[PDB]
CSV table of C-alpha atoms and ligand atoms in Angstrom, one decimal:
chain,number,residue,atom,x,y,z
Q,1,UNK,CA,-22.3,-0.4,-18.4
Q,2,UNK,CA,-18.6,-1.1,-18.5
Q,3,UNK,CA,-15.8,0.5,-16.3
Q,4,UNK,CA,-12.0,0.5,-17.1
Q,5,UNK,CA,-9.5,0.5,-14.2
Q,6,UNK,CA,-5.9,1.2,-15.0
Q,7,UNK,CA,-3.3,0.0,-12.4
Q,8,UNK,CA,-0.1,-2.0,-12.1
Q,9,UNK,CA,3.4,-2.6,-10.9
Q,10,UNK,CA,3.3,-3.1,-7.1
Q,11,UNK,CA,0.6,-3.7,-4.5
Q,12,UNK,CA,0.4,0.1,-3.7
Q,13,UNK,CA,-1.4,0.6,-7.1
Q,14,UNK,CA,-3.1,-2.9,-7.6
Q,15,UNK,CA,-4.7,-3.2,-4.1
Q,16,UNK,CA,-6.7,0.2,-3.9
Q,17,UNK,CA,-7.9,-0.6,-7.5
Q,18,UNK,CA,-9.1,-4.2,-6.5
Q,19,UNK,CA,-11.1,-2.5,-3.7
Q,20,UNK,CA,-12.6,0.0,-6.3
Q,21,UNK,CA,-13.4,-3.0,-8.6
Q,22,UNK,CA,-15.5,-4.7,-5.8
Q,23,UNK,CA,-17.5,-1.4,-5.3
Q,24,UNK,CA,-18.2,-0.9,-9.1
Q,25,UNK,CA,-19.3,-4.6,-9.1
Q,26,UNK,CA,-21.8,-4.2,-6.2
Q,27,UNK,CA,-23.4,-1.2,-8.0
Q,28,UNK,CA,-24.2,-3.3,-11.2
Q,29,UNK,CA,-21.2,-2.4,-13.5
Q,30,UNK,CA,-18.9,-4.7,-15.5
Q,31,UNK,CA,-15.3,-4.0,-14.5
Q,32,UNK,CA,-12.4,-4.5,-17.0
Q,33,UNK,CA,-8.7,-4.0,-16.0
Q,34,UNK,CA,-5.8,-2.2,-17.8
Q,35,UNK,CA,-2.3,-3.5,-17.2
Q,36,UNK,CA,1.2,-4.3,-18.6
Q,37,UNK,CA,3.2,-7.6,-18.6
Q,38,UNK,CA,5.7,-8.6,-15.8
Q,39,UNK,CA,3.8,-6.5,-13.1
Q,40,UNK,CA,1.9,-7.9,-10.1
Q,41,UNK,CA,-1.6,-7.4,-11.6
Q,42,UNK,CA,-0.8,-10.6,-13.6
Q,43,UNK,CA,-0.8,-12.5,-10.2
Q,44,UNK,CA,-3.7,-10.7,-8.5
Q,45,UNK,CA,-6.2,-9.5,-11.2
Q,46,UNK,CA,-7.0,-13.0,-12.9
Q,47,UNK,CA,-7.5,-14.4,-9.3
Q,48,UNK,CA,-10.1,-11.7,-8.6
Q,49,UNK,CA,-12.1,-13.1,-11.7
Q,50,UNK,CA,-11.5,-9.9,-13.7
Q,51,UNK,CA,-10.6,-9.4,-17.4
Q,52,UNK,CA,-7.0,-8.3,-17.8
Q,53,UNK,CA,-6.2,-6.3,-21.0
Q,54,UNK,CA,-2.3,-6.0,-21.4
Q,55,UNK,CA,-0.4,-3.0,-22.9
Q,56,UNK,CA,3.3,-2.9,-23.8
Q,57,UNK,CA,12.4,6.5,-27.2
Q,58,UNK,CA,9.0,8.1,-28.2
Q,59,UNK,CA,7.8,5.5,-30.8
Q,60,UNK,CA,7.5,3.1,-27.8
Q,61,UNK,CA,5.1,5.5,-25.9
Q,62,UNK,CA,2.9,5.7,-29.0
Q,63,UNK,CA,2.7,1.8,-29.3
Q,64,UNK,CA,1.3,1.8,-25.7
Q,65,UNK,CA,-1.2,4.5,-26.8
Q,66,UNK,CA,-2.5,2.6,-29.9
Q,67,UNK,CA,-3.1,-0.6,-27.7
Q,68,UNK,CA,-4.9,1.6,-25.0
Q,69,UNK,CA,-7.0,3.5,-27.7
Q,70,UNK,CA,-8.0,0.0,-29.0
Q,71,UNK,CA,-9.0,-1.3,-25.5
Q,72,UNK,CA,-11.2,1.8,-24.9
Q,73,UNK,CA,-12.7,1.6,-28.4
Q,74,UNK,CA,-13.6,-2.1,-27.8
Q,75,UNK,CA,-15.1,-1.6,-24.3
Q,76,UNK,CA,-16.9,1.8,-24.8
Q,77,UNK,CA,-16.6,2.4,-21.0
Q,78,UNK,CA,-18.8,4.9,-19.1
Q,79,UNK,CA,-15.8,5.9,-17.0
Q,80,UNK,CA,-12.0,5.2,-16.8
Q,81,UNK,CA,-10.2,5.2,-13.4
Q,82,UNK,CA,-6.4,5.4,-13.1
Q,83,UNK,CA,-4.5,4.3,-10.0
Q,84,UNK,CA,-0.8,4.2,-10.9
Q,85,UNK,CA,2.0,2.5,-12.8
Q,86,UNK,CA,3.3,2.9,-16.4
Q,87,UNK,CA,-0.2,2.0,-17.7
Q,88,UNK,CA,-2.1,5.2,-16.5
Q,89,UNK,CA,-0.1,7.6,-18.6
Q,90,UNK,CA,-0.9,6.1,-22.1
Q,91,UNK,CA,-4.2,4.8,-20.8
Q,92,UNK,CA,-5.5,8.1,-19.3
Q,93,UNK,CA,-4.6,10.0,-22.6
Q,94,UNK,CA,-6.4,7.3,-24.7
Q,95,UNK,CA,-9.5,7.8,-22.5
Q,96,UNK,CA,-9.5,11.6,-23.4
Q,97,UNK,CA,-8.9,11.0,-27.1
Q,98,UNK,CA,-12.1,8.9,-27.2
Q,99,UNK,CA,-14.0,11.4,-25.2
Q,100,UNK,CA,-14.6,8.9,-22.3
Q,101,UNK,CA,-14.6,10.6,-18.8
Q,102,UNK,CA,-11.4,10.2,-16.7
Q,103,UNK,CA,-10.8,10.1,-12.9
Q,104,UNK,CA,-7.3,9.9,-11.4
Q,105,UNK,CA,-6.2,8.8,-7.9
Q,106,UNK,CA,-2.9,9.6,-6.0
Q,107,UNK,CA,-2.0,7.1,-3.2
Q,108,UNK,CA,1.2,9.0,-2.1
Q,109,UNK,CA,1.9,12.3,-0.2
Q,110,UNK,CA,3.7,13.8,-3.3
Q,111,UNK,CA,1.9,13.5,-6.7
Q,112,UNK,CA,3.5,11.2,-9.4
Q,113,UNK,CA,4.9,12.5,-12.7
Q,114,UNK,CA,2.0,10.7,-14.6
Q,115,UNK,CA,-0.7,12.1,-12.2
Q,116,UNK,CA,0.8,15.7,-12.7
Q,117,UNK,CA,0.6,15.2,-16.5
Q,118,UNK,CA,-2.9,13.7,-16.4
Q,119,UNK,CA,-4.5,15.9,-13.7
Q,120,UNK,CA,-5.5,18.7,-16.3
Q,121,UNK,CA,-7.2,16.2,-18.6
Q,122,UNK,CA,-9.2,14.4,-15.8
Q,123,UNK,CA,-12.8,15.3,-14.7
Q,124,UNK,CA,-11.9,14.5,-11.0
Q,125,UNK,CA,-8.6,14.3,-9.2
Q,126,UNK,CA,-8.7,12.0,-6.2
Q,127,UNK,CA,-6.0,12.4,-3.5
Q,128,UNK,CA,-5.2,10.2,-0.6
Q,129,UNK,CA,-3.2,12.8,1.5
Q,130,UNK,CA,-4.1,16.6,1.8
Q,131,UNK,CA,-2.0,19.3,0.0
Q,132,UNK,CA,-0.8,16.7,-2.6
Q,133,UNK,CA,-2.5,18.6,-5.5
Q,134,UNK,CA,-2.4,22.5,-5.5
Q,135,UNK,CA,-6.2,23.2,-6.1
Q,136,UNK,CA,-10.0,17.9,-6.7
Q,137,UNK,CA,-11.2,15.9,-3.7
Q,138,UNK,CA,-9.6,14.2,-0.6
Q,139,UNK,CA,-11.1,10.7,-0.6
Q,140,UNK,CA,-8.2,9.0,1.2
Q,141,UNK,CA,-6.7,5.6,0.1
Q,142,UNK,CA,-9.3,2.9,-0.9
Q,143,UNK,CA,-8.6,0.1,1.7
Q,144,UNK,CA,-10.0,-3.5,1.7
Q,145,UNK,CA,-13.1,-3.7,4.0
Q,146,UNK,CA,-11.5,-6.7,5.9
Q,147,UNK,CA,-8.4,-4.6,7.0
Q,148,UNK,CA,-10.7,-2.3,9.1
Q,149,UNK,CA,-10.4,-3.4,12.8
Q,150,UNK,CA,-11.7,-2.0,16.1
Q,151,UNK,CA,-9.9,-1.6,19.5
Q,152,UNK,CA,-11.4,-5.0,20.5
Q,153,UNK,CA,-9.7,-7.0,17.6
Q,154,UNK,CA,-6.8,-7.9,19.9
Q,155,UNK,CA,-6.2,-9.2,23.4
Q,156,UNK,CA,-4.9,-6.8,26.2
Q,157,UNK,CA,-1.1,-6.3,26.1
Q,158,UNK,CA,-0.6,-6.5,29.9
Q,159,UNK,CA,1.2,-9.7,30.9
Q,160,UNK,CA,1.6,-10.9,27.3
Q,161,UNK,CA,4.4,-11.0,24.7
Q,162,UNK,CA,4.1,-8.3,22.0
Q,163,UNK,CA,3.6,-9.6,18.4
Q,164,UNK,CA,6.0,-8.0,15.9
Q,165,UNK,CA,5.1,-7.8,12.2
Q,166,UNK,CA,7.9,-6.7,9.8
Q,167,UNK,CA,6.6,-5.6,6.3
Q,168,UNK,CA,8.5,-5.6,3.0
Q,169,UNK,CA,6.4,-4.2,1.4
Q,170,UNK,CA,5.0,-5.6,-1.9
Q,171,UNK,CA,8.4,-6.6,-3.2
Q,172,UNK,CA,10.0,-7.1,0.2
Q,173,UNK,CA,12.6,-4.4,0.8
Q,174,UNK,CA,16.1,-5.9,1.5
Q,175,UNK,CA,17.6,-3.8,4.2
Q,176,UNK,CA,14.8,-4.5,6.8
Q,177,UNK,CA,15.7,-8.1,6.1
Q,178,UNK,CA,19.3,-7.4,7.3
Q,179,UNK,CA,18.6,-4.8,10.1
Q,180,UNK,CA,15.8,-6.9,11.9
Q,181,UNK,CA,17.7,-10.2,13.0
Q,182,UNK,CA,20.8,-8.1,14.1
Q,183,UNK,CA,18.6,-5.6,16.0
Q,184,UNK,CA,16.3,-8.3,17.5
Q,185,UNK,CA,19.3,-10.2,19.0
Q,186,UNK,CA,20.2,-7.2,21.1
Q,187,UNK,CA,16.7,-7.1,22.7
Q,188,UNK,CA,16.6,-9.3,25.9
Q,189,UNK,CA,14.8,-12.6,25.3
Q,190,UNK,CA,12.6,-11.8,28.4
Q,191,UNK,CA,11.0,-8.9,26.5
Q,192,UNK,CA,11.7,-10.0,22.9
Q,193,UNK,CA,8.5,-10.0,20.8
Q,194,UNK,CA,7.0,-12.9,18.7
Q,195,UNK,CA,8.1,-12.2,15.0
Q,196,UNK,CA,6.4,-12.6,11.5
Q,197,UNK,CA,8.7,-11.1,8.9
Q,198,UNK,CA,7.5,-10.4,5.3
Q,199,UNK,CA,10.7,-10.4,3.3
Q,200,UNK,CA,11.0,-10.3,-0.5
Q,201,UNK,CA,9.9,-13.0,-3.0
Q,202,UNK,CA,13.7,-13.6,-3.6
Q,203,UNK,CA,14.7,-12.9,0.1
Q,204,UNK,CA,12.4,-15.2,2.2
Q,205,UNK,CA,15.0,-18.1,2.3
Q,206,UNK,CA,18.0,-15.8,3.2
Q,207,UNK,CA,16.1,-13.7,5.9
Q,208,UNK,CA,15.3,-17.1,7.6
Q,209,UNK,CA,19.0,-17.9,7.8
Q,210,UNK,CA,19.8,-14.4,9.1
Q,211,UNK,CA,17.4,-15.0,12.1
Q,212,UNK,CA,18.7,-18.6,12.5
Q,213,UNK,CA,22.4,-17.5,12.7
Q,214,UNK,CA,21.9,-14.8,15.4
Q,215,UNK,CA,19.7,-17.3,17.4
Q,216,UNK,CA,16.4,-15.3,17.2
Q,217,UNK,CA,13.1,-17.1,16.1
Q,218,UNK,CA,10.7,-15.8,13.4
Q,219,UNK,CA,8.0,-17.0,10.9
Q,220,UNK,CA,9.7,-15.5,7.8
Q,221,UNK,CA,7.4,-15.4,4.7
Q,222,UNK,CA,7.9,-14.1,1.1
Q,223,UNK,CA,4.4,-12.6,0.8
Q,224,UNK,CA,1.2,-12.8,3.0
Q,225,UNK,CA,-2.2,-13.0,1.2
Q,226,UNK,CA,-3.9,-13.3,4.6
Q,227,UNK,CA,-3.4,-9.6,5.5
Q,228,UNK,CA,-6.5,-9.1,7.7
Q,229,UNK,CA,-5.1,-12.0,9.8
Q,230,UNK,CA,-1.5,-10.6,9.8
Q,231,UNK,CA,-2.7,-7.2,11.1
Q,232,UNK,CA,-5.0,-8.8,13.8
Q,233,UNK,CA,-2.1,-10.9,15.1
Q,234,UNK,CA,0.3,-7.8,15.2
Q,235,UNK,CA,0.5,-5.3,18.2
Q,236,UNK,CA,3.5,-3.4,16.5
Q,237,UNK,CA,4.7,-3.0,12.9
Q,238,UNK,CA,8.3,-2.1,11.6
Q,239,UNK,CA,7.8,-1.3,8.0
Q,240,UNK,CA,8.6,0.6,4.7
Q,241,UNK,CA,6.5,3.8,4.3
Q,242,UNK,CA,4.8,3.0,1.0
Q,243,UNK,CA,1.4,4.7,0.5
Q,244,UNK,CA,-0.9,1.7,1.2
Q,245,UNK,CA,1.0,0.2,4.2
Q,246,UNK,CA,0.6,3.7,5.8
Q,247,UNK,CA,-3.2,3.8,5.0
Q,248,UNK,CA,-3.7,0.2,6.0
Q,249,UNK,CA,-2.0,0.7,9.5
Q,250,UNK,CA,-4.8,3.3,10.2
Q,251,UNK,CA,-7.6,0.9,8.9
Q,252,UNK,CA,-6.0,-1.8,11.1
Q,253,UNK,CA,-5.4,0.8,13.9
Q,254,UNK,CA,-1.7,-0.3,14.3
Q,255,UNK,CA,1.3,1.4,15.9
Q,256,UNK,CA,4.3,1.6,13.5
Q,257,UNK,CA,8.0,2.3,13.3
Q,258,UNK,CA,8.5,3.5,9.7
Q,259,UNK,CA,11.8,3.1,7.7
Q,260,UNK,CA,11.2,5.2,4.5
Q,261,UNK,CA,10.8,13.0,-4.5
Q,262,UNK,CA,11.2,11.5,-0.9
Q,263,UNK,CA,7.6,10.2,-1.4
Q,264,UNK,CA,7.9,7.6,1.5
Q,265,UNK,CA,9.4,10.0,4.0
Q,266,UNK,CA,6.3,12.4,3.5
Q,267,UNK,CA,3.9,9.3,3.6
Q,268,UNK,CA,5.4,8.4,7.0
Q,269,UNK,CA,5.1,12.0,8.2
Q,270,UNK,CA,1.2,11.9,8.2
Q,271,UNK,CA,1.4,9.2,11.0
Q,272,UNK,CA,4.4,10.8,12.7
Q,273,UNK,CA,2.8,14.3,12.9
Q,274,UNK,CA,-0.1,13.1,15.2
Q,275,UNK,CA,2.0,10.5,17.2
Q,276,UNK,CA,0.5,7.4,15.4
Q,277,UNK,CA,3.8,6.4,13.8
Q,278,UNK,CA,7.5,6.8,14.6
Q,279,UNK,CA,10.1,7.9,12.0
Q,280,UNK,CA,13.3,5.8,11.9
Q,281,UNK,CA,15.5,6.9,8.9
Q,282,UNK,CA,17.4,4.1,7.1
Q,283,UNK,CA,20.7,6.0,6.6
Q,284,UNK,CA,20.9,6.7,10.4
Q,285,UNK,CA,19.3,3.9,12.5
Q,286,UNK,CA,21.7,1.0,13.2
Q,287,UNK,CA,20.9,-2.4,14.8
Q,288,UNK,CA,21.8,-1.0,18.3
Q,289,UNK,CA,19.4,2.0,17.8
Q,290,UNK,CA,16.4,0.0,16.6
Q,291,UNK,CA,16.9,-2.5,19.6
Q,292,UNK,CA,16.8,0.5,22.1
Q,293,UNK,CA,13.7,2.0,20.4
Q,294,UNK,CA,11.9,-1.4,20.5
Q,295,UNK,CA,13.1,-2.1,24.2
Q,296,UNK,CA,11.3,1.1,25.5
Q,297,UNK,CA,7.9,0.1,23.9
Q,298,UNK,CA,8.3,-3.5,25.1
Q,299,UNK,CA,9.3,-2.4,28.6
Q,300,UNK,CA,6.3,0.1,28.5
Q,301,UNK,CA,3.6,-1.4,26.2
Q,302,UNK,CA,1.0,1.3,27.3
Q,303,UNK,CA,2.9,3.4,24.6
Q,304,UNK,CA,1.6,1.1,21.8
Q,305,UNK,CA,-2.1,1.6,23.0
Q,306,UNK,CA,-1.8,5.5,22.7
Q,307,UNK,CA,-0.1,5.1,19.2
Q,308,UNK,CA,-2.9,2.6,18.2
Q,309,UNK,CA,-5.7,5.0,19.4
Q,310,UNK,CA,-4.3,7.8,17.3
Q,311,UNK,CA,-3.8,5.5,14.2
Q,312,UNK,CA,-7.5,4.3,14.4
Q,313,UNK,CA,-8.7,7.9,14.2
Q,314,UNK,CA,-6.7,8.6,11.0
Q,315,UNK,CA,-8.6,5.8,9.1
Q,316,UNK,CA,-10.9,6.9,6.3
Q,317,UNK,CA,-13.5,4.0,5.8
Q,318,UNK,CA,-15.5,5.9,3.0
Q,319,UNK,CA,-12.4,6.2,0.8
Q,320,UNK,CA,-13.5,3.4,-1.6
Q,321,UNK,CA,-17.2,4.6,-2.0
Q,322,UNK,CA,-16.3,8.3,-2.6
Q,323,UNK,CA,-13.7,7.4,-5.4
Q,324,UNK,CA,-16.4,5.2,-7.1
Q,325,UNK,CA,-19.0,8.0,-6.4
Q,326,UNK,CA,-16.6,10.5,-8.2
Q,327,UNK,CA,-16.3,8.1,-11.2
Q,328,UNK,CA,-20.1,7.4,-11.5
Q,329,UNK,CA,-21.2,11.1,-11.1
Q,330,UNK,CA,-19.2,12.0,-14.3
Q,331,UNK,CA,-19.9,8.7,-16.1
M,401,UD1,C1,10.1,0.1,-3.2
M,401,UD1,C2,9.0,0.8,-4.0
M,401,UD1,O1,9.2,1.1,-5.1
M,401,UD1,N1,7.9,1.1,-3.3
M,401,UD1,C3,6.8,1.9,-3.8
M,401,UD1,C4,5.6,0.9,-4.0
M,401,UD1,O2,5.3,0.4,-2.7
M,401,UD1,P1,4.5,-0.9,-2.5
M,401,UD1,O3,3.3,-0.8,-3.5
M,401,UD1,O4,5.5,-2.0,-2.5
M,401,UD1,O5,3.9,-0.7,-1.0
M,401,UD1,P2,2.5,0.1,-0.5
M,401,UD1,O6,2.7,0.2,0.9
M,401,UD1,O7,2.2,1.3,-1.4
M,401,UD1,O8,1.4,-1.0,-0.8
M,401,UD1,C5,1.5,-2.3,-0.3
M,401,UD1,C6,0.2,-3.1,-0.7
M,401,UD1,O9,0.7,-4.4,-0.9
M,401,UD1,C7,0.0,-5.2,0.1
M,401,UD1,N2,0.7,-6.4,0.5
M,401,UD1,C8,2.1,-6.4,0.7
M,401,UD1,C9,2.7,-7.6,1.1
M,401,UD1,C10,2.0,-8.7,1.3
M,401,UD1,O10,2.4,-9.7,1.9
M,401,UD1,N3,0.6,-8.8,1.0
M,401,UD1,C11,0.0,-7.6,0.7
M,401,UD1,O11,-1.3,-7.6,0.4
M,401,UD1,C12,-0.4,-4.3,1.2
M,401,UD1,O12,-1.4,-4.9,2.1
M,401,UD1,C13,-0.8,-3.1,0.5
M,401,UD1,O13,-2.1,-3.3,0.0
M,401,UD1,O14,4.5,1.6,-4.5
M,401,UD1,C14,4.1,2.9,-4.1
M,401,UD1,C15,3.7,3.7,-5.3
M,401,UD1,O15,2.4,4.3,-5.3
M,401,UD1,C16,5.1,3.7,-3.2
M,401,UD1,O16,4.4,4.2,-2.0
M,401,UD1,C17,6.4,2.9,-2.7
M,401,UD1,O17,7.4,3.7,-2.4
């Protein structure tokens, strides 16, 4: 029958859901999506060929519930899977009111306010990171099959310039856009890596000028759809510690320098704890300090191979199947 997937806002909620949508489709189920206007599901969900049902101070919360109650009443789904955003709260409750089974998924290291409110009413609570829910099943984060790379995906580092990928993420954090050109100018041009910077949608034009003025050289973009290609090119990542970028770095088996209820700092810790990632706090690390940290791994790239070997082992390839298996066991 029909399946309802509720997710929106940023890529961290929309992308694990698009991967779940592909899995339900291969099993012979009709997937329908639950979103809100303005969010990024309006860009991605219609492109995937999937039906987008849109939802819109307590009287405002009830308006969202009526619309969600209607969408569920019309689709009579076998299961409803929530993944994050404003949508899951009124959507997940609507699912219970109509006696339709509900499964929730938490991408982050600390559970979200909606996921904490919805967990007691869900049949299965799927978690990405361990210890996030005090109880439930640890599936990991559902990552796009294409983002899974082996240690043969890239050329040896020895006698080659390192490729540096700077990630936004989904909206394109600002800071990083400022810190990177200033920091990269202090790194000798003999060791300076090749740069691909994913700035914001409104910050791509300005981040280009920032690199241009300090005389660096980078391929600055607002957003990259060709992510499997972006990860294969990269030897090192300097990123934001959003749930999916963290889980994708493991699938891609990539060393990272992460700049993160302190959800991101905890997300970064799961890489850091094993030696897969390196924690660089925003409030502390200046342009001089990032340059010095980069300089040591460029001078000694064998460091990147150990970080990559550890990252590859933290990947959870069955994250998508087990989330969908948890939905279809209760459906
Ligand atoms: C600033 C902010 O509020 N960030 C939050 C946001 O992160 P956000 O969703 O922005 O970042 P995440 O790392 O969670 O997810 C990024 C997703 O967007 C994709 N991507 C991004 C850029 C691009 O060029 N192409 C592309 O496909 C990534 O491959 C990945 O699939 O949502 C999450 C909520 O669950 C949290 O972890 C973050 O703290």
